[PDB]
Amino acid sequence: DKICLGHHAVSNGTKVNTLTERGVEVVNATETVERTNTPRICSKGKRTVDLGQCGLLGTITGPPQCDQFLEFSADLIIERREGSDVCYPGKFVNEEALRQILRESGGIDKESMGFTYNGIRTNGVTSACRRSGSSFYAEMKWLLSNTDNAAFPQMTKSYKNTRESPAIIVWGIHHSVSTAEQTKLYGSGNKLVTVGSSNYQQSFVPSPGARPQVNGLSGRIDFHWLILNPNDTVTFSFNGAFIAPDRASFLRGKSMGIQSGVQVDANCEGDCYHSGGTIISNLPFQNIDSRAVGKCPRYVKQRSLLLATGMKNVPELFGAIAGFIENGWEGLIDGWYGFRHQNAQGEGTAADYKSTQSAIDQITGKLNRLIAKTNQQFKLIDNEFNEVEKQIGNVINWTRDSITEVWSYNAELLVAMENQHTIDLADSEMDKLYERVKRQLRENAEEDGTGCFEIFHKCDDDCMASIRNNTYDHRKYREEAMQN
Amino acid sequence: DKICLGHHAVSNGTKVNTLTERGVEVVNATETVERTNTPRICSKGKRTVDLGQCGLLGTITGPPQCDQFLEFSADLIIERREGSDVCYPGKFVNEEALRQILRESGGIDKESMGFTYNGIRTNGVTSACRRSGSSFYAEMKWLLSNTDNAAFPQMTKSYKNTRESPAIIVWGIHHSVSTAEQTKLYGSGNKLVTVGSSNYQQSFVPSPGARPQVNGLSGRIDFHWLILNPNDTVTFSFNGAFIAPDRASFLRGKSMGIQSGVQVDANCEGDCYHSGGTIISNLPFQNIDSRAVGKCPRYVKQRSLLLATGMKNVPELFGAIAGFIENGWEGLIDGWYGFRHQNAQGEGTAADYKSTQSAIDQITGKLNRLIAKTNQQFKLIDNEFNEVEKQIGNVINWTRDSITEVWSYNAELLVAMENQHTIDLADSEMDKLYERVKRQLRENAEEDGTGCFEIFHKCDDDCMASIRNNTYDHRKYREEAMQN
Amino acid sequence: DKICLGHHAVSNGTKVNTLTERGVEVVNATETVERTNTPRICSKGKRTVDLGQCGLLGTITGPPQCDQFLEFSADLIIERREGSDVCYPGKFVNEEALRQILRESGGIDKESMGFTYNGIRTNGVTSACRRSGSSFYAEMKWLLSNTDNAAFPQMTKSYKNTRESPAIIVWGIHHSVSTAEQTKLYGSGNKLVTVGSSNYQQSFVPSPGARPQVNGLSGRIDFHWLILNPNDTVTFSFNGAFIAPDRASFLRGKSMGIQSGVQVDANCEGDCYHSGGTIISNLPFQNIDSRAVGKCPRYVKQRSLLLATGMKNVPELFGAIAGFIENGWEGLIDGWYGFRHQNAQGEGTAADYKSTQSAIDQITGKLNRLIAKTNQQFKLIDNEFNEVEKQIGNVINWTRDSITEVWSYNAELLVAMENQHTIDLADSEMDKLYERVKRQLRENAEEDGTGCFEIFHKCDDDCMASIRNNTYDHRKYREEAMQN
Ligand SMILES: *[C@@H]1O[C@H](CO)[C@@H](O)[C@H](O)[C@H]1NC(C)=O
Ligand SMILES: *[C@@H]1O[C@H](CO)[C@@H](O)[C@H](O)[C@H]1NC(C)=O
Ligand SMILES: *[C@@H]1O[C@H](CO)[C@@H](O)[C@H](O)[C@H]1NC(C)=O
Ligand SMILES: *[C@@H]1O[C@H](CO)[C@@H](O)[C@H](O)[C@H]1NC(C)=O
Ligand SMILES: *[C@@H]1O[C@H](CO)[C@@H](O)[C@H](O)[C@H]1NC(C)=O
Ligand SMILES: *[C@@H]1O[C@H](CO)[C@@H](O)[C@H](O)[C@H]1NC(C)=O
Ligand SMILES: *[C@@H]1O[C@H](CO)[C@@H](O)[C@H](O)[C@H]1NC(C)=O
Ligand SMILES: *[C@@H]1O[C@H](CO)[C@@H](O)[C@H](O)[C@H]1NC(C)=O
Ligand SMILES: *[C@@H]1O[C@H](CO)[C@@H](O)[C@H](O)[C@H]1NC(C)=O
């Protein structure tokens, strides 16, 4: 005598945020922000150099903790906390512009320069750079006088680039503890070290003075560096206090460099590296670390953003889900939408296939659109272990904190618009399934108001099956149902 | 005999911009861009130091206009137009990196260094730094010779950091007017000032020469500064022309620094500061000043962006507001939607409560979403009064003029999408109120085409009240209204 | 006996991307990303200086390839590949901060300084700067000794700014090949060049040494530059090796500077300049060159983004286009929506004017909104021909590659939302045209299910015309059509 219709519901829903409400209960939802990392470095398919105690700048000068790393070759370069560049006390000049070159180099190739020295002692060593006894750096030479006070002749040496890749030359200038020991090593008079190339003329000078003792010594060595282009030349003229190189340095290819504190994993495989592990996920957004390098998801401020993947949960815009149909059915477990007739034969519930699959195919089309990959690869511009310069370091924090505010706005605006459209999408599929059964069942039944029809003739289980499969012929029943 | 329905309207509407039209008349609207500022500095709950004539860098050297500000402590630091750092003519080196430290410091703490000087005159004063007679800076010492030409012995002093906060040490180097007066103060020979720490070795040198007269004098003093870390040391060796410090400098906490031109207000309270006052508002966007610091609304290019908070105004997507209902009622003053019957009893207008409150509750849910607070605090990276460096100043203007173009695009796209959905929201509430009265009044009435029903029986004021309260029983009237 | 209705279709559609599907066939579409450039520089209405072999920094020193360009004046400045700044071998100091000043200057004005020199030879020339025989730069003076070895007196000169615009003064310092030729030109002793102003005290020094031969010579000239403010002064004291200026330099106005490789076109007119031509288009997005200057469209990563400007193509959300109306008509060529009756008179198709023009007027309102102009003018911050500094050059590439990712996200999100709304817009105009004909034709006809009505009386071509023009009086036909 009557044929009703409704939708499915579950007892425990999930609260998502829509464009016009907060906390809307929905049948099913999906997290869209990654929060769990793998506490390892996943490097399947990448040859990997773990430096350890070797600093990143010890591969171009060669302290005794960088003997096995002078001519490395890898695609992933991992620096550590304890990495030191020097053994005799000193530092570089413009050390952060040089580390950004060597992280993307993919290795380094050393070739000899070939300087010959005469009337001069070259094997002056130090007590700090110890391999077996006392030694010095592995690729440079401590040039000092032969007689302890007499003289140091003025020298002039030259080198010429012959390859097609740019070179990295590094030299050193020695600042003694006093003038009383600068004479004890070199001689007298002013000391000049003129460094000349096509684009370089600086003429450095030592500066003896009292210093606090860094690990036993009171002198310093400052290392400088320039870059040759092909078919160019370099000239070093000096009359004392010079730390001459022996080998040049070249590049190999492309790589990346990360700064980590965890181990190296050879079976796992991921391409998003931060200082605490590896972010391996397909989600577009993440809330783990804002300084991650590689192909990574974007950093948001919010920790949880749920995406609705079902209709609204109504347990027991178009006005069907909690419109005139006031509750959902918990017995309907086959699909999303269904029929429940009631006649002289008894009761019986079905489920509709063409309307359930018309709603699932549009929800899955939204999930394939959001689960996508970023093709943009981000490098590493700041240094975690030691302190880039203060004025440009405030520009980097200002820019990163402004792009984070933009992406965390596009995150919650995308989701709240995507759940507003999803709830309205499954609301329209119930209003089209109501109006198909209405205009099929033309003049033989009336409407109740609760989303249920009341048919004016004897329509048994064979007859009610003619309405579900869209084969109801109203013309056979027309002349009898107009009596009622 | 008939029962109509319509919506309310006002004579003077407001033109807003939608996603598909320009200038749509709506019942009520709301401005969403702030344009009025308070011409004061609102600082209730913040301890505040107004510097005035004291420069921001005079608190570490102590000219006579910074006597009361040597050991200040505040949370809001206000600099002025007339602030000068020095009294003897000179300047600093890297003066903009140092002002960015002191604005966020929250005060400064001076502790003594304790250098003793012997065989040497220390109380050399100048005629420009006048407190009572002639004096010098308040925390530094003018070291010069005792006999007017004879000699200046080579000196060496040292200091050691003992606290846990970093220090700010400042020294000075004196460049005389000539060599004839450099001998008249110090002696003869070359002058070296070697400054040594764990990370610093520079060995500065004076440079006598003719200068134009800045306020009476023709010499200069250049001030330099380094930062100690805890358990580190500094050594100053010199044989002349040195301006030695007496006290160190420490930090206290967290603050902000603004550059203003207006007064200080102690009763008002706001947290968005620009150079002309205080932006106090709840609106998300503002068009006052693009260089405001603190928790501020975002800067847009547009001066007016109206947000619709009512239905479309039709005076005398779903097709009800100016669809088949062609005009709005100006007599309906109770709610937004209503009924107006007409029968043998006369006339009478009502208003519907369940449909009016279903539209207001969704408009107010949009206003609570847009009226929100920014939690991100912006500092001050450029200097209005004096001229940051030209190459990095062009990077700051390029970045700020690109984020302004992004937010003024998200401003007018949010509003035009928000008014497109609002007009469609109040259009659907009229189509649901029409179709509820339709299927309630099942076979007893027909439709006109103007949104009005014409009932086929005698339905008086008691009977018409049964339709407004949703209690109309059609079964009692069915067998008589089918005669017509 | 029956009156149907449908929409128009074409055989070949166009596949666009919507918010919920990929590749949706639509009647007509529109490209929204520009890809074709004009391989010229369009400069109608702009006075234009093509430099050619003159470098941009040769207009302030005057080598012999910049004789006609010393006092230029233009609004568009075009540099070339072969532009060289110097004739004697050397370079500038901070050459990139100075080129950014001169590109926006709009010309340059030279005024004389007026130094007189006595007891000294001034006309020392070089063999590299050749105009007729041997000469030197056009606005500077090579000051050297009179007797080949004897002496060079110490000199002191001064200049004072008298205008209201800032000056550009440039001087030079000569670094000889050795000390044996520095004596052969100047004299003996140390050489100082003290440069003093209100904000400048540097006291430079020459540096003789062996250099590789750049085009015949082994010495260098380094050029330096400062800026005067009005009522300020400059003093040059020296005892040798100085390259003194003769004329100052001023600015004229506002301009832009491009770096191109193509010719200059005087009849074309465009305002977006890159290194390969001119982007002339009205489209908001472009995929030609990401380093374009002027009023340009924004750079996206995608090469094609089609915008739908018609309904969905169904050849032979509201459920009319491929809802219950299952195909489109290819005979309907007048408008977008129409009628096709069928009776005893025969057949006949019409087209509806009020529904076709109600859909076109809303599509055109979207095209006027997207085709708009950017008012923001972008300058040129990096240098294509020669290599800005490595650390700040990595900041510029990092920022540009992040704004490109934002705009190419707002590009495909705007289009996919704009085509989702367009298809739903022309779907609702068919559902309003179906329900207008329905409630007009009140109780005289029934519905089929295919979007066609079947009328219960004899309604000929004059009668069917009463339905298309909205003049059908159902009351005249009511008492006869209720018999059926
Ligand atoms: C609900 O969504 C989740 C995704 O979070 C999915 O794994 C699951 O299969 C869905 N269905 C049910 C019945 O949980
Ligand atoms: C930049 O922000 C980081 C926080 O990740 C902080 O450690 C660092 O000190 C900041 N740098 C500057 C110069 O403020
Ligand atoms: C209903 O449709 C199915 C499949 O189209 C068909 O097998 C069946 O005979 C139809 N009729 C009834 C009464 O089930
Ligand atoms: C209209 O909106 C304004 C907000 O601008 C509000 O103050 C006012 O109460 C609203 N109603 C009327 C009747 O003006
Ligand atoms: C940056 O823009 C401001 C405008 O607020 C201007 O005063 C300043 O001179 C600009 N700086 C540079 C280096 O162009
Ligand atoms: C209408 O509804 C109200 C409240 O539900 C009730 O008090 C009243 O009796 C109802 N009937 C009429 C005829 O007003
Ligand atoms: C289709 O759109 C294009 C724009 O690409 C327009 O030029 C054309 O006139 C439109 N109509 C037809 C029938 O091609
Ligand atoms: C910046 O990117 C450009 C690509 O247009 C490249 O030519 C240039 O070398 C890059 N600069 C640096 C410092 O990486
Ligand atoms: C239909 O409308 C047109 C214009 O409104 C009118 O000229 C015509 O007489 C009307 N009637 C018929 C039967 O065409």
PDB file of N, CA, C and O in Angstrom, chain A residues 289-318:
ATOM      1  N   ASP A 289      57.798  19.621  10.592  1.00  0.00           N
ATOM      2  CA  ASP A 289      58.936  20.528  10.642  1.00  0.00           C
ATOM      3  C   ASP A 289      58.876  21.458   9.444  1.00  0.00           C
ATOM      4  O   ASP A 289      58.706  21.007   8.310  1.00  0.00           O
ATOM      5  N   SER A 290      59.014  22.756   9.696  1.00  0.00           N
ATOM      6  CA  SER A 290      58.859  23.752   8.647  1.00  0.00           C
ATOM      7  C   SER A 290      60.123  23.973   7.835  1.00  0.00           C
ATOM      8  O   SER A 290      60.091  24.752   6.879  1.00  0.00           O
ATOM      9  N   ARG A 291      61.221  23.311   8.181  1.00  0.00           N
ATOM     10  CA  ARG A 291      62.504  23.479   7.514  1.00  0.00           C
ATOM     11  C   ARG A 291      62.938  22.197   6.821  1.00  0.00           C
ATOM     12  O   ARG A 291      64.104  21.808   6.874  1.00  0.00           O
ATOM     13  N   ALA A 292      62.004  21.522   6.168  1.00  0.00           N
ATOM     14  CA  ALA A 292      62.309  20.268   5.502  1.00  0.00           C
ATOM     15  C   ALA A 292      62.718  20.518   4.058  1.00  0.00           C
ATOM     16  O   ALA A 292      62.225  21.437   3.401  1.00  0.00           O
ATOM     17  N   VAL A 293      63.632  19.690   3.562  1.00  0.00           N
ATOM     18  CA  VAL A 293      64.186  19.865   2.227  1.00  0.00           C
ATOM     19  C   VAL A 293      63.811  18.667   1.369  1.00  0.00           C
ATOM     20  O   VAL A 293      63.509  17.582   1.874  1.00  0.00           O
ATOM     21  N   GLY A 294      63.825  18.873   0.059  1.00  0.00           N
ATOM     22  CA  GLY A 294      63.394  17.866  -0.886  1.00  0.00           C
ATOM     23  C   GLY A 294      61.971  18.091  -1.352  1.00  0.00           C
ATOM     24  O   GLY A 294      61.394  19.169  -1.203  1.00  0.00           O
ATOM     25  N   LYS A 295      61.397  17.042  -1.932  1.00  0.00           N
ATOM     26  CA  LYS A 295      60.002  17.069  -2.365  1.00  0.00           C
ATOM     27  C   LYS A 295      59.127  16.781  -1.155  1.00  0.00           C
ATOM     28  O   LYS A 295      58.882  15.623  -0.812  1.00  0.00           O
ATOM     29  N   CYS A 296      58.645  17.836  -0.510  1.00  0.00           N
ATOM     30  CA  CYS A 296      57.924  17.701   0.739  1.00  0.00           C
ATOM     31  C   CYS A 296      56.505  18.241   0.616  1.00  0.00           C
ATOM     32  O   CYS A 296      56.227  19.071  -0.255  1.00  0.00           O
ATOM     33  N   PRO A 297      55.586  17.780   1.457  1.00  0.00           N
ATOM     34  CA  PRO A 297      54.305  18.471   1.586  1.00  0.00           C
ATOM     35  C   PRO A 297      54.491  19.812   2.270  1.00  0.00           C
ATOM     36  O   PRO A 297      55.510  20.088   2.902  1.00  0.00           O
ATOM     37  N   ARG A 298      53.473  20.649   2.155  1.00  0.00           N
ATOM     38  CA  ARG A 298      53.572  22.016   2.630  1.00  0.00           C
ATOM     39  C   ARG A 298      53.285  22.101   4.120  1.00  0.00           C
ATOM     40  O   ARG A 298      52.534  21.299   4.674  1.00  0.00           O
ATOM     41  N   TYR A 299      53.909  23.078   4.768  1.00  0.00           N
ATOM     42  CA  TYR A 299      53.791  23.231   6.209  1.00  0.00           C
ATOM     43  C   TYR A 299      52.600  24.119   6.547  1.00  0.00           C
ATOM     44  O   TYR A 299      52.472  25.226   6.019  1.00  0.00           O
ATOM     45  N   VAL A 300      51.736  23.638   7.441  1.00  0.00           N
ATOM     46  CA  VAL A 300      50.570  24.379   7.888  1.00  0.00           C
ATOM     47  C   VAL A 300      50.683  24.595   9.389  1.00  0.00           C
ATOM     48  O   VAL A 300      51.492  23.965  10.070  1.00  0.00           O
ATOM     49  N   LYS A 301      49.866  25.508   9.906  1.00  0.00           N
ATOM     50  CA  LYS A 301      49.858  25.740  11.344  1.00  0.00           C
ATOM     51  C   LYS A 301      48.902  24.799  12.060  1.00  0.00           C
ATOM     52  O   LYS A 301      49.149  24.421  13.209  1.00  0.00           O
ATOM     53  N   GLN A 302      47.804  24.427  11.408  1.00  0.00           N
ATOM     54  CA  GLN A 302      46.801  23.587  12.046  1.00  0.00           C
ATOM     55  C   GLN A 302      47.287  22.149  12.136  1.00  0.00           C
ATOM     56  O   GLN A 302      48.001  21.662  11.260  1.00  0.00           O
ATOM     57  N   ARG A 303      46.879  21.462  13.196  1.00  0.00           N
ATOM     58  CA  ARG A 303      47.317  20.096  13.422  1.00  0.00           C
ATOM     59  C   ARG A 303      46.333  19.052  12.914  1.00  0.00           C
ATOM     60  O   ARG A 303      46.714  17.883  12.790  1.00  0.00           O
ATOM     61  N   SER A 304      45.092  19.431  12.614  1.00  0.00           N
ATOM     62  CA  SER A 304      44.095  18.467  12.168  1.00  0.00           C
ATOM     63  C   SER A 304      43.100  19.147  11.245  1.00  0.00           C
ATOM     64  O   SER A 304      42.524  20.178  11.604  1.00  0.00           O
ATOM     65  N   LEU A 305      42.901  18.565  10.062  1.00  0.00           N
ATOM     66  CA  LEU A 305      41.964  19.079   9.058  1.00  0.00           C
ATOM     67  C   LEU A 305      41.273  17.870   8.434  1.00  0.00           C
ATOM     68  O   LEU A 305      41.855  17.183   7.593  1.00  0.00           O
ATOM     69  N   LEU A 306      40.037  17.615   8.848  1.00  0.00           N
ATOM     70  CA  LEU A 306      39.310  16.443   8.385  1.00  0.00           C
ATOM     71  C   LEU A 306      38.518  16.754   7.124  1.00  0.00           C
ATOM     72  O   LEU A 306      37.917  17.822   6.999  1.00  0.00           O
ATOM     73  N   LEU A 307      38.507  15.801   6.202  1.00  0.00           N
ATOM     74  CA  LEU A 307      37.832  15.919   4.915  1.00  0.00           C
ATOM     75  C   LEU A 307      36.694  14.910   4.864  1.00  0.00           C
ATOM     76  O   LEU A 307      36.921  13.713   5.053  1.00  0.00           O
ATOM     77  N   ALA A 308      35.481  15.388   4.603  1.00  0.00           N
ATOM     78  CA  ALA A 308      34.313  14.520   4.598  1.00  0.00           C
ATOM     79  C   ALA A 308      34.274  13.662   3.344  1.00  0.00           C
ATOM     80  O   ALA A 308      34.438  14.156   2.227  1.00  0.00           O
ATOM     81  N   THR A 309      34.035  12.368   3.538  1.00  0.00           N
ATOM     82  CA  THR A 309      33.935  11.425   2.433  1.00  0.00           C
ATOM     83  C   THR A 309      32.622  10.647   2.472  1.00  0.00           C
ATOM     84  O   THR A 309      32.529   9.561   1.895  1.00  0.00           O
ATOM     85  N   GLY A 310      31.604  11.191   3.131  1.00  0.00           N
ATOM     86  CA  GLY A 310      30.280  10.602   3.148  1.00  0.00           C
ATOM     87  C   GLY A 310      29.204  11.650   3.329  1.00  0.00           C
ATOM     88  O   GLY A 310      29.510  12.838   3.444  1.00  0.00           O
ATOM     89  N   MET A 311      27.940  11.237   3.358  1.00  0.00           N
ATOM     90  CA  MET A 311      26.853  12.176   3.581  1.00  0.00           C
ATOM     91  C   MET A 311      26.789  12.573   5.051  1.00  0.00           C
ATOM     92  O   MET A 311      27.525  12.060   5.896  1.00  0.00           O
ATOM     93  N   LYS A 312      25.878  13.490   5.361  1.00  0.00           N
ATOM     94  CA  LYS A 312      25.694  13.908   6.741  1.00  0.00           C
ATOM     95  C   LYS A 312      24.980  12.822   7.533  1.00  0.00           C
ATOM     96  O   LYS A 312      24.032  12.203   7.050  1.00  0.00           O
ATOM     97  N   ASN A 313      25.452  12.582   8.751  1.00  0.00           N
ATOM     98  CA  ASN A 313      24.901  11.543   9.605  1.00  0.00           C
ATOM     99  C   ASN A 313      23.711  12.095  10.374  1.00  0.00           C
ATOM    100  O   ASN A 313      23.870  12.956  11.243  1.00  0.00           O
ATOM    101  N   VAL A 314      22.522  11.600  10.046  1.00  0.00           N
ATOM    102  CA  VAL A 314      21.307  11.918  10.789  1.00  0.00           C
ATOM    103  C   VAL A 314      20.792  10.610  11.377  1.00  0.00           C
ATOM    104  O   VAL A 314      20.062   9.875  10.698  1.00  0.00           O
ATOM    105  N   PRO A 315      21.170  10.251  12.597  1.00  0.00           N
ATOM    106  CA  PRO A 315      20.724   8.984  13.178  1.00  0.00           C
ATOM    107  C   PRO A 315      19.291   9.092  13.683  1.00  0.00           C
ATOM    108  O   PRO A 315      18.698  10.167  13.730  1.00  0.00           O
ATOM    109  N   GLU A 316      18.742   7.944  14.071  1.00  0.00           N
ATOM    110  CA  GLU A 316      17.452   7.893  14.755  1.00  0.00           C
ATOM    111  C   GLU A 316      17.700   7.997  16.253  1.00  0.00           C
ATOM    112  O   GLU A 316      18.094   7.024  16.903  1.00  0.00           O
ATOM    113  N   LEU A 317      20.723  22.385   1.782  1.00  0.00           N
ATOM    114  CA  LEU A 317      20.520  23.272   0.647  1.00  0.00           C
ATOM    115  C   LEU A 317      19.428  22.807  -0.305  1.00  0.00           C
ATOM    116  O   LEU A 317      18.795  23.655  -0.939  1.00  0.00           O
ATOM    117  N   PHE A 318      19.181  21.503  -0.417  1.00  0.00           N
ATOM    118  CA  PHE A 318      18.078  20.992  -1.221  1.00  0.00           C
ATOM    119  C   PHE A 318      16.929  20.458  -0.382  1.00  0.00           C
ATOM    120  O   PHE A 318      15.834  20.253  -0.912  1.00  0.00           O
TER     121      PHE A 318
END
